[PDB]
Amino acid sequence: GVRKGWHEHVTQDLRSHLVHKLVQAIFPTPDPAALKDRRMENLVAYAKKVEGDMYESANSRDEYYHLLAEKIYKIQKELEEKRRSRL
Amino acid sequence: DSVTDSQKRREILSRRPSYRKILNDLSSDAPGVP
């Protein structure tokens, strides 16, 4: 009936899209030199690690999205406050 | 307030215009096809 199919209906592909968008959220369009830059890899590393914590702590698909959605908004606010000076 | 940070936060989401917008819209089509 229901044993441990939780992670069976969730694919790596689905998550891959989530991580990619997670990066996009912070850096929408990096230039060719930025993409091959260490800072970008570190940025992806953040997305990769955060992806790990989410999957481990989520326990549920709804929570999986919920955790990320709140997390993205938190960054978004931080970026916006930062932009206030850097006009 | 810092103790019940999670609870207090949870309440705000319930009245977060952009959060609700992005929450509904984005989850409306989670990409995923091999």
Binding site: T29, K71, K74 | -
Partner: peptide
């Protein structure tokens, strides 16, 4: 909450970029 905010350095660079 498991740290939903980034360290300053990550934010510092991204803001320094503006397409």
């Amino acid at each position: 909450d498991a740290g939903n905010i980034l360290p300053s350095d990550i934010m510092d660079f991204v803001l320094k970029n503006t397409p």
